[PDB]
Paper text:
[name] is a member of the 7βS family known to generate trimethylation on lysine 525 (K525me3) on the eukaryotic translation elongation factor 2 ([name]). [name] performs the essential function of facilitating ribosomal translocation during mRNA translation. In both Saccharomyces cerevisiae and humans, [name] encodes an uncharacterized [name] domain as well as its catalytic methyltransferase (MTase) domain. Based on these data, we propose that the [name] domain of [name] confers substrate specificity by orienting [name]-[name] toward the [name] active site.
Our initial effort in crystallizing wildtype [name] failed to generate diffractable crystals. To overcome this challenge, we designed a [name] construct harboring a triple mutation for reduction of surface entropy (see Experimental procedures), which permitted structure determination of full-length [name] in complex with cofactor–by-product S-adenosyl homocysteine (SAH) at 3.3-Å resolution. The crystal structure of the [name]–SAH complex belongs to the I422 space group, containing three complexes in one asymmetric unit. The structure of [name] reveals a two-lobe architecture, in which the N-terminal [name] domain stacks right on top of the C-terminal methyltransferase domain, creating a potential catalytic cleft commonly observed for DNA methyltransferases. The [name] domain is dominated by a five-helix bundle (αa, αb, αc, αe, and αf), which packs against a following two-stranded (β1 and β2) β-sheet via αa- and intervening αd-helix. The methyltransferase domain assumes a Rossmann fold, in which a seven-stranded central β-sheet is flanked by three α-helices on both sides. The predicted model bears striking resemblance to the experimental crystal structure, with root-mean-square deviation (RMSD) of 1.2 Å over 319 aligned Cα atoms. Of note, the experimental and predicted models reveal the nearly identical SAM-binding pocket with approximately 14 residues participating in the coordination of the ligand SAH Nevertheless, the experimental and predicted models show a slight difference in the helical orientations (αe and αf) in the [name] domain, as well as the positionings of the SAH-engaging residues W139 and Y251. Using the structural data provided by X-ray crystallography and AlphaFold, we determined the [name] domain of [name] forms a five-helix bundle distinct from the 7βS domain. By testing the catalytic activity of a truncated [name] construct lacking the [name] domain, we found the [name] domain is required for [name] methylation in vitro and in human cells.
Numbering used by the authors: 6 to 126, 134 to 330
Amino acid sequence: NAGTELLLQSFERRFLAARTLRSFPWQSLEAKLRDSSDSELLRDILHKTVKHPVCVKHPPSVKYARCFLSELIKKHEAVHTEPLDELYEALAETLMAKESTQGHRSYLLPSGGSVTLSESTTGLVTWDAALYLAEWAIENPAVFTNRTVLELGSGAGLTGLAICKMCRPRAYIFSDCHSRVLEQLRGNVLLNGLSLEADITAKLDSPRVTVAQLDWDVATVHQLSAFQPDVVIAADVLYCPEAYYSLVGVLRRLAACREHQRAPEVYVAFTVRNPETCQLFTTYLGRAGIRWEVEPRHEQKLFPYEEHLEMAMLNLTL
Ligand SMILES: Nc1ncnc2c1ncn2[C@@H]1O[C@H](CSCC[C@H](N)C(=O)O)[C@@H](O)[C@H]1O
């Protein structure tokens, strides 16, 4: 019984997150369909995916839906041909009507809510390290509760939206330098029901959410002072070795910004796509006077990661 529930959770989370088709656990479904002639498992998969309420409100790209339903029909055809009307009617609905419009990826939260993002086809995508950092923030809510959080390179804003909906920060500052990324970020913040600080904030439960432009290369000590962060986080921001120096300079300025009172806690998570990345970043941090420790690997529970590469996260003392 436990295997079936875990399989259903896997299918739900992987379809909602629009993960790659090859990542779906088709072999466990094959075994379960071979052991039972009951199409109710396929029906439960149907209701937890294409007919899931969060999908119904924010559907993914129609291509994804039709490929998924075609492969699910193909897996249904191998076992006893008890025709399930719901699968074919749903595929009819997907195919018969509408256009591609825009895509959506949704991520479920422990509170029963969800984070819905309208990321499109490199900052316009939700990288895995964002999922990793969001999970870590969910399992360590004391770091952010009623705190001021500044994210460097928010991208689509998955991590920040998850933190705003799970850890109750006092204020959250999404920061990026690319204009289209910031536009999609504001659209995603409004899509998830969060009102910006410029707008009149209501009831003080809503965190003061701001989407500020913050280019790492020219960010001044005054501009960074203006934010007054208690925590600074970044995820998958180590794309090129040259940007290491820009990011380290930004952290340097951030510490220097408020010489009076202490420096904020800095957490940098990244996908280890090249060990040279981590080694070079650590050497630069040591040369700049920032101390660093490796945070322990946390069990990956909620979110389905795209590539399952080795994840890492550094706690930096400024
Ligand atoms: N020099 C710079 N200054 C400010 N932001 C930068 C930057 N260089 C890259 N970025 C931003 O950093 C992001 C890295 S992609 C990571 C996005 C997000 N953290 C996620 O994991 O989904 C991009 O969105 C890009 O816009």
